[PDB]
Amino acid sequence: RAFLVSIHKYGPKAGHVYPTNLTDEDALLNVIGMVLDGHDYENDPNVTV
């Protein structure tokens, strides 16, 4: 599968990505790409978007 991610513009977690919540306006606005290959968040917190 695949899912769309979205950067943070500003904040304490500014620069990090979170999956695009379709109900939220900033995830729709600040969408930055998507993730295809699969990953292990327990292994590394740096995904390749």
Partner 1 sequence: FPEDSTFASELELYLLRTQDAEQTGMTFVHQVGSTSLPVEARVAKVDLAKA
User: Which positions lie near partner 1, rule CB under 8 A?
Assistant: 37, 44, 46-48
Tell me how far the alpha carbon of residue 41 is from its chain's centroid: 13
* E-only strand ranges, the chain: 3-7, 17-19, 31-35
CA distance 8 to 24: 13
Task: Between 21 and 46, name the residue whose CB sits nearer to partner 1.
Answer: 46
For the bound state, the minimum distance from the C-beta of residue 43 to partner 1, rounded and expressed in Å, comes to 11
Judged by beta carbon, residue 28 or residue 49, the one nearer partner 1 is 49
The residue among 12 and 45 lying less far from partner 1, judged by its C-beta, is 45
